[PDB]
Write an enzyme that holds these catalytic residues in place. Sequence first.
Site: not given
Ligand SMILES: [Mg+2]
Length: 202
Positions: A90, A152
């Site tokens: 992804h 992140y």
């Molecule tokens: Mg991820």
Amino acid sequence: MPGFYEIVIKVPSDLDEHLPGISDSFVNWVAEKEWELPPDSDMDLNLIEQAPLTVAEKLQRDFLTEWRRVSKAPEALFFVQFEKGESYFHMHVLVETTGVKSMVLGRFLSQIREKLIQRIYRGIEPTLPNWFAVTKTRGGNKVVDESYIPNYLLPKTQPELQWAWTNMEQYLSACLNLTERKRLVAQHLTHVSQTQEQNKEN
Ligand SMILES: [Mg+2]
């Protein structure tokens, strides 16, 4: 100062499972491509899956071209990270809000999605469950600040990290260099700490 929208795009990795009905030419196109790391990279090319990368490279490149057109922001900042997940390959696409009001984002994203289907998949939609998705608050569209990236995305390592692209100057070397990502994360957290320190003081 502007924030970022996030679109998560799933990338197919199993031809029969993910892409039933895909054309032969699409299959040849994936097979033909080969990618190499830049000289300044410290990544292991062995841990990087070439076929999924071929699809991802095009998807991000095309999404950005469409985004620039609808947004009217030719110089929009972006950071894209391509990852190998537990279920799916992804892509996290972060793009600045400029030129796209939240009220109209769904319509624009929808237009873009059709274009990707035409161009990348040659008219055959991928059989991936919620494949092209804007991050939402539960709610409306989420907007995040630049801090999302050191928090992140930058911390990711191979093999979860597959590739990344950016036009943001502070991250250009970070994209394919693990040592650099590590430095940036430490630097950001240092800034955060120093800021809290100041707060307690005073
Ligand atoms: Mg991820």
